[PDB]
Design a protein around this motif. Structure first.
Motif, mmCIF file in Angstrom:
data_model
loop_
_atom_site.group_PDB
_atom_site.id
_atom_site.type_symbol
_atom_site.label_atom_id
_atom_site.label_comp_id
_atom_site.label_asym_id
_atom_site.label_seq_id
_atom_site.Cartn_x
_atom_site.Cartn_y
_atom_site.Cartn_z
ATOM 1 N N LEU A 275 26.471 -3.665 -36.540
ATOM 2 C CA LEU A 275 27.457 -2.660 -36.859
ATOM 3 C C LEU A 275 26.610 -1.404 -36.741
ATOM 4 C CD1 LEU A 275 28.471 -1.110 -40.046
ATOM 5 C CD2 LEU A 275 29.903 -1.162 -38.056
ATOM 6 N N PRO A 276 26.957 -0.507 -35.792
ATOM 7 C CA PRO A 276 26.287 0.775 -35.574
ATOM 8 C C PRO A 276 26.635 1.835 -36.614
ATOM 9 C CG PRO A 276 27.193 -0.100 -33.586
ATOM 10 C CD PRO A 276 27.945 -0.725 -34.747
ATOM 11 N N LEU A 277 25.592 2.579 -36.966
ATOM 12 C CA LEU A 277 25.708 3.667 -37.909
ATOM 13 C C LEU A 277 25.107 4.814 -37.081
ATOM 14 C CD1 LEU A 277 24.484 3.503 -41.736
ATOM 15 C CD2 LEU A 277 25.183 5.474 -40.519
ATOM 16 N N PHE A 278 25.847 5.817 -36.611
ATOM 17 C CA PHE A 278 25.271 6.938 -35.919
ATOM 18 C C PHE A 278 25.045 8.024 -36.938
ATOM 19 C CE2 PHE A 278 25.020 6.920 -31.285
ATOM 20 C CZ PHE A 278 25.490 5.640 -31.012
ATOM 21 N N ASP A 279 23.831 8.556 -36.898
ATOM 22 C CA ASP A 279 23.425 9.715 -37.670
ATOM 23 C C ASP A 279 23.493 10.792 -36.598
ATOM 24 O OD1 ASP A 279 22.096 11.880 -39.062
ATOM 25 O OD2 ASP A 279 20.684 10.520 -39.917
ATOM 26 N N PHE A 280 24.300 11.807 -36.813
ATOM 27 C CA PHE A 280 24.528 12.838 -35.817
ATOM 28 C C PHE A 280 24.417 14.179 -36.550
ATOM 29 C CE2 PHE A 280 27.872 13.547 -32.190
ATOM 30 C CZ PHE A 280 26.855 14.012 -31.346
ATOM 31 N N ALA A 281 23.241 14.781 -36.473
ATOM 32 C CA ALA A 281 22.961 16.010 -37.237
ATOM 33 C C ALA A 281 22.704 17.250 -36.370
ATOM 34 C CB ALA A 281 21.714 15.816 -38.102
ATOM 35 N N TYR A 282 22.354 17.058 -35.116
ATOM 36 C CA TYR A 282 22.027 18.212 -34.258
ATOM 37 C C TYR A 282 23.000 18.334 -33.041
ATOM 38 C CZ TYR A 282 17.675 17.813 -37.086
ATOM 39 O OH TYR A 282 16.798 17.719 -38.125
ATOM 40 N N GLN A 283 24.286 17.960 -33.223
ATOM 41 C CA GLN A 283 25.298 18.069 -32.117
ATOM 42 C C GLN A 283 25.422 19.532 -31.676
ATOM 43 O OE1 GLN A 283 29.417 16.654 -32.732
ATOM 44 N NE2 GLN A 283 29.876 16.675 -30.575
ATOM 45 N N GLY A 284 25.219 19.722 -30.387
ATOM 46 C CA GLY A 284 25.241 21.051 -29.753
ATOM 47 C C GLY A 284 23.807 21.447 -29.406
ATOM 48 N N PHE A 285 22.699 20.777 -29.787
ATOM 49 C CA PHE A 285 21.382 21.323 -29.478
ATOM 50 C C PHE A 285 20.607 20.788 -28.289
ATOM 51 C CE2 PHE A 285 20.248 24.144 -32.959
ATOM 52 C CZ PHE A 285 21.108 23.779 -33.979
ATOM 53 N N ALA A 286 21.220 19.749 -27.663
ATOM 54 C CA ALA A 286 20.584 19.135 -26.505
ATOM 55 C C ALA A 286 21.263 19.638 -25.264
ATOM 56 C CB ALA A 286 20.688 17.619 -26.564
ATOM 57 N N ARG A 287 22.380 19.136 -24.730
ATOM 58 C CA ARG A 287 22.946 19.805 -23.548
ATOM 59 C C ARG A 287 24.193 20.659 -23.905
ATOM 60 N NH1 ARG A 287 20.819 14.766 -25.244
ATOM 61 N NH2 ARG A 287 23.082 14.692 -25.343
ATOM 62 N N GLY A 288 24.990 20.235 -24.901
ATOM 63 C CA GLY A 288 26.192 20.900 -25.360
ATOM 64 C C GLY A 288 26.964 19.952 -26.277
ATOM 65 N N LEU A 289 27.891 20.464 -27.093
ATOM 66 C CA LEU A 289 28.736 19.669 -27.979
ATOM 67 C C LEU A 289 29.325 18.426 -27.367
ATOM 68 C CD1 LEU A 289 30.794 22.671 -29.333
ATOM 69 C CD2 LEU A 289 29.046 21.451 -30.637
ATOM 70 N N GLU A 290 29.887 18.445 -26.164
ATOM 71 C CA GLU A 290 30.524 17.248 -25.571
ATOM 72 C C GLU A 290 29.558 16.185 -25.049
ATOM 73 O OE1 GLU A 290 30.922 20.854 -24.384
ATOM 74 O OE2 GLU A 290 32.710 20.642 -23.152
ATOM 75 N N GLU A 291 28.584 16.643 -24.255
ATOM 76 C CA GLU A 291 27.558 15.793 -23.634
ATOM 77 C C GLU A 291 26.725 15.046 -24.672
ATOM 78 O OE1 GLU A 291 24.191 14.800 -22.374
ATOM 79 O OE2 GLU A 291 24.068 15.371 -20.299
ATOM 80 N N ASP A 292 26.567 15.691 -25.835
ATOM 81 C CA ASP A 292 25.794 15.174 -26.935
ATOM 82 C C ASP A 292 26.489 14.081 -27.657
ATOM 83 O OD1 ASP A 292 24.003 17.130 -26.243
ATOM 84 O OD2 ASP A 292 23.995 18.152 -28.118
ATOM 85 N N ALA A 293 27.812 13.953 -27.513
ATOM 86 C CA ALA A 293 28.544 12.870 -28.141
ATOM 87 C C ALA A 293 28.841 11.729 -27.177
ATOM 88 C CB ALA A 293 29.853 13.390 -28.711
ATOM 89 N N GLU A 294 28.494 11.784 -25.883
ATOM 90 C CA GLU A 294 28.717 10.686 -24.934
ATOM 91 C C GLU A 294 28.065 9.338 -25.256
ATOM 92 O OE1 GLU A 294 30.839 12.933 -24.124
ATOM 93 O OE2 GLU A 294 30.037 13.872 -22.348
#
Ligand SMILES: *Cc1c(COP(=O)(O)O)cnc(C)c1O
Ligand SMILES: *Cc1c(COP(=O)(O)O)cnc(C)c1O
Lengths: 396, 396
Positions: free
Chosen positions: B207-226
């Motif tokens: 069962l995956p648990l995603f920790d997502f704290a820096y959305q928007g800091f790598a390529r952009g908000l959308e690409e970072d959630a792919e």
């Protein structure tokens, strides 16, 4: 992993709200709320915290993390409110305060700390008490026990049953005391009983945990802490979970404190390192805005004087309806004598009704109240008073 | 009860700050911080959240309790940011979001829920990972295990060791994934690896648990959630702990979300009743101000456009110094080749230094960094760059 069977159950007071809005009929009266309300039915933002919020907009330049234990200013404003200005406790650096998310937030932090760093296994809470106390303590692995307090009859504190029941506690047991009178009953100790209980605890070895959420709503900020200070004089170690939700009307900003006192500064710092270890593993560090508002007002003489006038108006308003409900009940028929309502402090009181007069009052009369008969007198106003006392006389 | 022996120990990064201020000397450079900083060294309040704060001062009329799971607006703004507008997950009412105190706050709530309502006993986190992950999970009674990720050498993701190590996990084990690249390493999965890991987990029963704290800091908000969405396509149930501390620069207001997805709406509501039971026993309900700021901006087209320009400036600024540090290192001597720094996403990177080049760098050179060699490139600016790359060449 979650598909099919996990579970439920509804909160006592919190599920009663979703049938308040749903009722069409004119009359609809919600006592059974947990916040203050003014003579017009609103829970306004205090004039004083709106002023401190404009100060914070113009002045703050960063939104950077607070230390684990929060804003220093807040911590000593709290210590001075809880204990007094000249206290052996503050000058001797015996107390450490973590800024915490609401008073519940402070109790879970008392709980995790105690459950993990201490030998404490049971805590003793009153019967009745605030229902969310069992959950906070059980979630920290601690089971909860109950000490007599009211039972019912005389409508007062049953002093001898609470003590004859508190003797079943051993020495690393926490006993939780309500500092500012009692949720749900509004019933005190008198100062002579707080002194009679502070010695008992010193002699049996209990560690007191004061839950102090309504400071300022019974006689005044100072008088309301005399129980606490009567124990802080006698104790070496103590814990208090204070809250600024109901006195700064700062409810959803989550503003509380968890103060630990220990015998000396060197001990309380070692102990407080683990309290901070507890916090780091929960929410990491506390919300700045509301605590930033409480510390700006408590440290500004202009501002703190407008706040204290605003706490005295709320306090005077609740006293007024305690006074007025028991009078309208006399001149509206009234079967039973309700004189006990006056000097029963704060917002909540047990109306004395059965769990059948409440459901008769709610299904087709429009008055809401908690099934245990607990009413919020701050939900009472002057032109909703005689519709409400009339409905109550109708059921006895 | 607390007098004599309880304990200690200092936080890895958090104790390194109290020797940053203490150093007299000119040069003093703190990399080893955890926040963003602009080209002048400050962590400013975003223009966009100052505008939403003036809106809130003029508009709010009460400070009354939020529901246990917070502000509705916030919850769906989050679901749409994490998953996209047209997602089978939102239209099918498969996800429930509790508004929570910071991303750590969301992980403790994933933890208490899981520890108490599920059969989950171990969670697998990466090596390396964010150190406070072990504490949050251990405090909920869960022991933590580690899956390979970097080891070191090539300065990249060791894909085959993470999988050969993840096979030692059984089926009700949680595996925690960093969505937006990795703290401390800045190292991805590529989209083709996130797809290769989403199937594995579907077939082994994690069962995956995603920790997502820096959305928007790598390529952009959308690409970072792919990565997330590549798993949300394949999964029936998942959990994500999102944070708005580092992208809304809202750090001390404690603004996060805990989203639970379950297979259908009827299940996710039963499950989410217990997640709300968990929360009630911790802090009762979440802090309003910061979440009220995030929801006002995300739902206002004017405001949300100023915010996105501000997230693109931070994101572009960090990329700039990744680009510039590896260049100044070439033209300042430089022993080793540091080309790996670029495309390693976000604020933190492993400089590659030993736990002896760091202490040589800190005692008498003034550059601070975490002993593990982790540096924050947002602590790097243009006129502190060549003092810093010079000090590093001096030690190799
Ligand atoms: C209200 C209350 C609290 C905590 O209130 P917060 O809303 O979290 O500040 C704690 N104890 C008692 C007895 C209360 O009535
Ligand atoms: C920063 C961070 C968090 C949580 O941050 P908050 O300050 O509580 O919002 C969670 N996970 C990782 C990996 C982080 O870097």
């Amino acid at each position: 992993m979650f598909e099919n069977i996990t579970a439920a159950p509804a909160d006592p007071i919190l599920g009663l709200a979703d049938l308040f809005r749903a009722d069409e009929r004119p009359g609809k009266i919600n006592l059974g709320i947990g916040v203050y309300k003014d003579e017009t039915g609103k829970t306004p933002v205090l004039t004083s915290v709106k002023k401190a919020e404009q100060y914070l907009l113009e002045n703050e330049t960063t939104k950077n993390y607070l230390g684990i234990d929060g804003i220093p200013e807040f911590g000593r404003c709290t210590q001075e409110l809880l204990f007094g200005k000249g206290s052996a406790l503050i000058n001797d650096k015996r107390a450490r305060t973590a800024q915490t998310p609401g008073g519940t937030g402070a109790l879970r932090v008392a709980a995790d700390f105690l459950a993990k760093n201490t030998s404490v296994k049971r805590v003793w809470v009153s019967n009745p008490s605030w229902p969310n106390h069992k959950s906070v303590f059980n979630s920290a692995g601690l089971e909860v026990r109950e000490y007599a307090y009211y039972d019912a009859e005389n409508h007062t504190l049953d002093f001898d049953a609470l003590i004859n029941s508190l003797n079943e506690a051993q020495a690393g047991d926490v006993v939780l005391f309500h500092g500012c009178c009692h949720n749900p009953t509004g019933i005190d100790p008198t100062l002579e009983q707080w002194q009679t209980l502070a010695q008992l605890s010193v002699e049996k070895g209990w560690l007191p945990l004061f839950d102090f959420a309504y400071q300022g709503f019974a006689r005044g900020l100072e008088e309301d802490a005399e129980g606490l200070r009567a124990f802080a004089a006698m104790h070496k170690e103590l814990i208090v979970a204070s809250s600024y939700s109901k006195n700064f009307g700062l409810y959803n900003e989550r503003v509380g404190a968890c103060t630990l006192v220990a015998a000396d500064s060197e001990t309380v710092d070692r102990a407080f390192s683990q309290m901070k270890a507890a916090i780091r593993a929960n929410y990491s560090n506390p919300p700045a805005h509301g605590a930033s508002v409480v510390a700006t007002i408590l440290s500004n003489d202009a501002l703190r004087a407008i706040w204290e006038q605003e706490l005295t108006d709320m306090r005077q308003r609740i006293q007024r309806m305690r006074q007025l409900f028991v009078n309208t009940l006399q001149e509206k028929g009234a079967n039973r004598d309700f004189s006990f309502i006056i000097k029963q402090n704060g917002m909540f009181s047990f109306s004395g009704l059965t769990k059948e007069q409440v459901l008769r009052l709610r299904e087709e009369f429009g008055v809401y109240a908690v099934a245990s008969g607990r009413v919020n007198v701050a939900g009472m106003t002057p032109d909703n008073m005689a519709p409400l006392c009339e409905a109550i006389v109708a059921v006895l």
